[PDB]
């Protein structure tokens, strides 16, 4: 439920929205929040962000060196579980090509969805305060009491005659 500015999954810029409803949006669904929380966590190289030297991933250790596939997978699979709301990791297809020296892995992560605790900070309210009456209706009655009775009588006259 971690709120934050929404990042476009397709381009990487802020998700200002479609041309018909351009604006700014907050990440509300846990899925969207977790997506960008993993994306930033994996995209920032370790130590390259000032104000926090411990954040990021240490790509320099592996890239450019002769490395064992098994060691890399452990670190990749470990960084994911640093988020407190990750249920499990389903599958992991780690493959390496020696000709091009490229490495490419696949996997998915499962996360549940929570409640909103309070709507005070977001948009709307859930209550239905009453509406003041109109004109002399309060002190003298209402005509609808006649209309509903007339309709009931008419429908009952309709019911008895077979159709």
């Amino acid at each position: 439920q971690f709120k934050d500015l929404l990042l476009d999954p397709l381009t990487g810029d802020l998700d200002f929205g479609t041309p018909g409803d351009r604006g700014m949006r907050l990440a509300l669904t846990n899925q969207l929040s977790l997506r960008q929380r993993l994306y930033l966590r994996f995209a920032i190289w370790a130590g390259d962000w000032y104000f926090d030297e411990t954040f990021g991933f240490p790509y320099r250790t592996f890239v450019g060196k002769k490395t064992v596939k098994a060691v890399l997978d452990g670190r990749i699979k470990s960084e994911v579980r640093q988020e407190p709301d990750v249920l499990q990791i389903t599958d992991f297809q780690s493959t390496m090509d020696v000709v091009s020296r490229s490495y490419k892995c696949f996997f998915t992560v499962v996360t549940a969805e929570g409640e909103e605790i309070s709507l005070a900070f977001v948009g709307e309210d859930e209550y239905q305060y009453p509406t003041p009456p109109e004109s002399n209706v309060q002190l003298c009655g209402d005509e609808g009491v006649i209309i509903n009775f007339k309709n009931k009588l008419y429908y009952l006259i309709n019911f008895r005659l077979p159709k």
């Binding site: 030297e53 411990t54 098994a70 452990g74 640093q82 992991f92």
Partner: protein, 249 residues
């Protein structure tokens, strides 16, 4: 020393500090999840206790199996008091029960025979390439996480079932005698003892309470700035709070 050496010094602080953050945050994640339970199947799996191994879903109920368990033991203890009498003898008084202790020894091999995916150790182990999957290593970082997070473990032994046991120590020996495997020993002892319906809740206590630290009045004590308002519904609020609440001055 040299300006270049300052960069080398900085690396020590960062990498050493970053190491504990990964360990510390992971431990903090434990003790926060209460919908997770850990169970260890010391023995009995192939005799009757198979019924309990089927109930675990790899997501919130987890099973720990070992490639081999050499021995396990269970010993409860009691204390007896004694006072002296004028007859040059000793009598006895009430007695007490001293919880209980459990220990076992096992081994995790880098060449497994029975690779059951339901076991939580074999979550990611490769079926056809076991020795490169690093099974012996993969067991240490999961066993250590359980112990250092103070989980209440449940042991499913063939003879009986034990609950509310806390790990106290463990060992890992890569002696040259066997190799390609780790000898593991563990000890446990019995740790014998908000939300929820208002009906079931009873009168609680919190003791003396000072000013809340998340809002104003602490800033005046901490000598900080009050947070400006976001404008919405101006000229309606300001008239009322300023008259009914005032400002800290």
């Amino acid at each position: 020393i040299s300006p270049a050496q300052q960069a080398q010094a900085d690396k020590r602080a960062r990498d050493a500090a970053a190491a504990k953050r990964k360990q510390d945050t992971e431990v903090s994640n434990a003790k926060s999840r209460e919908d997770i339970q850990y169970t260890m199947f010391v023995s009995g799996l192939r005799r009757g206790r198979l019924n309990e191994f089927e109930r675990k879903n790899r997501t919130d109920d987890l099973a720990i199996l070992f490639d081999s368990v050499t021995t396990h033991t269970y010993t409860k203890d009691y204390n007896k008091s004694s006072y002296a009498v004028e007859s040059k003898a000793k009598a006895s008084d009430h007695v007490t029960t001293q919880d209980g202790k459990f220990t076992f020894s096992g081994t995790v091999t880098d060449s497994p025979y029975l690779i059951d995916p339901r076991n939580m150790i074999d979550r990611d182990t490769d079926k056809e390439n076991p020795m490169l999957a690093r099974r012996p290593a993969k067991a240490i970082e999961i066993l250590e996480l359980i112990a250092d997070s103070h989980q209440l473990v449940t042991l499913v032994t063939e003879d009986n079932i034990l609950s509310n046991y806390v790990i106290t120590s463990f060992q890992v020996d890569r002696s040259s005698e066997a190799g390609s495997s780790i000898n593991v020993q563990v000890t446990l002892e019995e740790f014998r003892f908000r939300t929820s319906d208002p009906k079931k809740a009873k009168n609680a206590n919190t003791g003396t309470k000072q000013t809340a630290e998340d809002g104003a009045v602490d800033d005046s004590a901490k000598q900080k700035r009050q947070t400006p308002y976001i404008g919405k519904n101006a000229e309606t609020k300001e008239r009322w709070e300023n008259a009914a609440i005032g400002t800290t001055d």
